[PDB]
Design a protein around this ligand. Structure first.
Ligand SMILES: OC[C@H]1O[C@H](O)[C@H](O)[C@@H](O)[C@H]1O
Ligand SMILES: [Ca+2]
Ligand SMILES: [Ca+2]
Ligand code: NA
Ligand code: NA
Ligand code: NA
Length: 731
């Protein structure tokens, strides 16, 4: 009794990861009538393994249970094999076992209200391969009731669920049981008694979803899933969580007001491998590797790096100077994957001339490649997430990835080397990263050192317009292979058009419908007729997902590429930080519709009270000055509107060798005032002008103090398509 049909929202299809093709409602994968075991079904979801469908639970009416059935669709041309799972945010609630074509649909009835569940995940796992895995969910119904008791919070101590520190056994299942218990009491406190705890893939919650700016493995094994939670404070009590294998350590997803306090995350076997340089000459480099810390084999005289259940090849190294921990000047990525000769005694001879690149005995090579399958901490469809004194020491990708979320606060902690590991490296990519977010971002009082990329990157994802189908319909593509599939437009959200050739944001529109055709292609229908200037070759970005940014009182040091990247029109405040030997530029304002397809014009940027010490000793993409403003504009001569606007650089201290201070393209209202610049000769000078401007306007350079003393004039600026009258000075 008491069931109503589930109406699956169109937004749930856009949030679904599905391994092949399109997810359909009330039709099979093959776009025919749903049919399982010879029996027809009028309504359901036609998906294909592997897939995972997030299904929100209505607040009204009050839901007691989800009922339905599942099985292989008869439209499959062969005998597929799928395991269906109904999941909460922390546990598998029901599994079908392996289902095959011809088997009758298997029914389920899942408790919702008594588990405190407001989001379910409907997963179809491919089992072996996904050939013929046409997977149906059918007869989906909510069992509903008149009233439900409001839950009044609880304190859940993870030790009461079997979590024990100091043993190399998987503590994942215990912790996930504790999370489930806290959810069904309405949130509160999750207490973790102080200790070192181990986590492995075998007991993680296997989920399938897309993570922006990462590789796209089909399965993320989530060890600490803080998903579908409201009003939860996780008390780490200074614990250390150690991870093994390829996993997502932490996930905050479909949650509100979740905070994590006083917790550290590391891997015993890093994603990267350190080698100490022992000897060099023009043909060879001899190194030593601690094989216990970094297991490896030499296979056909090539490195094979090894962790639990994984092997990775070598692609390149980052080279770190002995004693200082700086990235060696004028190196950047050193690409190599050559002859390795074992010498015994943990010593290896590499067929590699590193001497010529400045490497010396005592230096450290961080051996790595560009693979980034899983971030350390993922925040996804979460509102008001906080990390307080959270240290993310290592990750197989970015340490912290936040996407499609609103309001995020990180205070203290950071991405730094754990004492006693002897490492110089931390994250396998960015420290923190914010892709299509909104509300306020605040990252403060943190230490970010040794990452294989920037300390922060805030941007939108812009899609390419592939075709205008009619006056209301666009075919759009996710253009970069590491930013596909996750939702970027939902019904009701606003679209901003971008003229492709000139990188000029244009008009706006409202999404009426959006259909994901596969992981890289969507069809968007807008409410009103498209502006006539919108054509194939333009781009689109979401006008509802721009965050404000406060990046303050942090230390950023000894990291690959740039210190920080910002592309958002809301206020950006970069204040009180120390950028200490960031390898590349300290700050980059980028934006493009041709390469990374990351966009978001800055309209209000304050960079004040920072200290910049000998940044930009090695060059990377776009690193033309300590502060570089480098949107990519294919036809700059034809551009009318300036991309970036109102950038204020004041009251900073630059301790720098002879390298440009400020490079900017397509920027209007750009002030470099009341800064202190102290020049040294510790690194080789570039011999270029300190200010370089390409199609800029309303530049003011005034009241700076420079040592050794000089007076800056127009002759200290390189001007390209920038009339000299647009550059003003002042005593
Ligand atoms: O330049 C943009 C680029 O910056 C860093 O390298 C990030 O790791 C990438 O994912 C991408 O955002
Ligand atoms: Ca299969
Ligand atoms: Ca156009
Ligand atoms: Na496919
Ligand atoms: Na309790
Ligand atoms: Na012009």
């Amino acid at each position: 009794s008491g069931t109503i049909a589930v109406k699956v929202p169109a937004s749930s299809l856009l949030m679904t990861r599905q391994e092949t093709g399109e997810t359909r409602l009330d039709r099979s994968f093959s776009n025919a009538g749903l049919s399982i075991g010879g029996k027809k079904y009028a309504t359901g979801i036609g998906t294909h393994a592997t897939s995972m469908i997030p299904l929100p639970v209505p607040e009204n009416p009050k839901v007691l249970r989800l009922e339905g059935a599942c099985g292989i669709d008869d439209g499959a041309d062969g005998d597929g094999s799928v395991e269906f799972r109904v999941m909460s945010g922390s546990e598998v609630l029901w599994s079908s076992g392996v289902m095959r074509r011809g088997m009758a649909a298997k029914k389920f009835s899942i408790p919702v209200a008594e588990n405190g569940i407001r989001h379910l995940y409907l997963m179809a796992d491919r089992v072996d391969n996904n050939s013929y895995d046409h997977a149906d969910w059918v007869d989906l119904a909510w069992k509903t009731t008149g009233s439900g008791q409001g839950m009044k919070g609880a304190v859940v101590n993870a030790s009461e669920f079997g979590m024990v520190p100091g043993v190399r056994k998987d503590q994942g299942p215990a912790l996930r049981a504790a999370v489930s218990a806290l959810r069904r009491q309405g949130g509160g406190v999750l207490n973790i008694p102080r200790g070192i705890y181990h986590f492995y893939p075998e007991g993680a919650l296997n989920m399938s979803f897309h993570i922006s700016n990462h590789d796209q493995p089909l399965i993320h094994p989530v060890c600490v899933p803080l998903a579908d939670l409201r009003n939860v404070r996780v008390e780490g009590n200074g614990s250390l969580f150690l991870f093994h294998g390829k996993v997502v350590p932490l996930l905050v997803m479909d949650s509100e007001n979740v905070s994590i306090n006083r917790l550290s995350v590391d891997y015993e076997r890093s994603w990267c491998t350190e080698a100490r340089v022992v000897k060099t000459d023009d043909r060879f480099t001899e190194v030593e590797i601690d094989k216990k810390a970094y297991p490896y084999e030499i296979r056909n005289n090539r490195f094979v790096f090894q962790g639990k259940g994984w092997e990775e090849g070598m692609g390149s190294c980052m080279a770190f100077e002995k004693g200082t921990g700086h990235i060696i000047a004028n190196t950047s990525d050193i690409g190599w994957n050559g002859h390795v000769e074992p010498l015994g005694g943990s010593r290896l001879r590499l067929s590699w001339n590193l001497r010529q690149k400045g490497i010396k005995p005592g230096d450290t090579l961080v051996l790595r490649n560009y693979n980034r399958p899983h971030p350390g901490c993922v925040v996804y469809r979460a509102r008001k997430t906080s990390l307080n004194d959270v240290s993310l020491h290592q990750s197989s990708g970015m340490a912290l990835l936040v996407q499609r979320s609103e309001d995020f606060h990180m205070k203290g902690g950071g991405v730094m080397v754990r004492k006693g590991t002897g490492r110089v490296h931390t994250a396998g990519a960015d420290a923190t990263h914010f892709s299509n977010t909104r509300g306020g971002i605040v990252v403060e009082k943190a230490l970010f050192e040794g990452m294989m990329d920037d300390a922060i990157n805030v941007h939108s994802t812009c899609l390419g317009v592939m075709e205008v189908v009619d006056s209301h319909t666009l075919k759009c593509k996710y253009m970069h292979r590491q930013a596909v599939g996750f939702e970027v437009f939902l019904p009701g959200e606003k679209i901003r058009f971008i003229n492709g050739p000139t990188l000029e944001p244009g008009g706006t529109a409202t999404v009426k419908t959006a259909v994901k055709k596969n992981s890289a292609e969507m069809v968007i229908t807008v409410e009103e007729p498209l502006p006539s200037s919108v054509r194939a070759g333009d781009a689109v970005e979401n006008a509802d997902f721009y965050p404000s940014v406060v990046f303050r009182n942090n230390i950023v040091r000894n990291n690959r590429a740039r210190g920080s990247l910002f592309t958002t029109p809301e206020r950006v405040l970069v204040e009180g930080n120390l950028f200490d030997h960031s390898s590349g530029s300290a700050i980059l304002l980028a934006g493009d519709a041709q390469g990374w397809y990351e966009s978001g014009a800055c309209h209000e940027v304050v960079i004040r009270k920072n200290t910049f010490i000998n940044n930009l000793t090695s060059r990377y993409q776009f690193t033309n000055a300590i502060i570089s403003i480098y949107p990519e504009v294919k036809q700059l001569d034809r551009q009318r509107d300036y991309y970036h606007r109102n950038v204020l650089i004041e009251n900073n201290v630059f301790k720098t060798f002879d390298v440009p201070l400020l490079f900017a393209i397509s920027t209007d209202n750009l002030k470099f005032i009341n800064n202190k610049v102290i020049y040294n000769d510790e690194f080789k000078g570039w011999g270029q002008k300190p200010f370089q401007f390409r199609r800029c306007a309303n530049i003011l350079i005034k009241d700076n103090k420079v040592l050794p003393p000089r007076t800056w004039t127009l002759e200290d600026c390189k001007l390209e398509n920038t009339p000299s009258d647009q550059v003003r000075f002042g005593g």
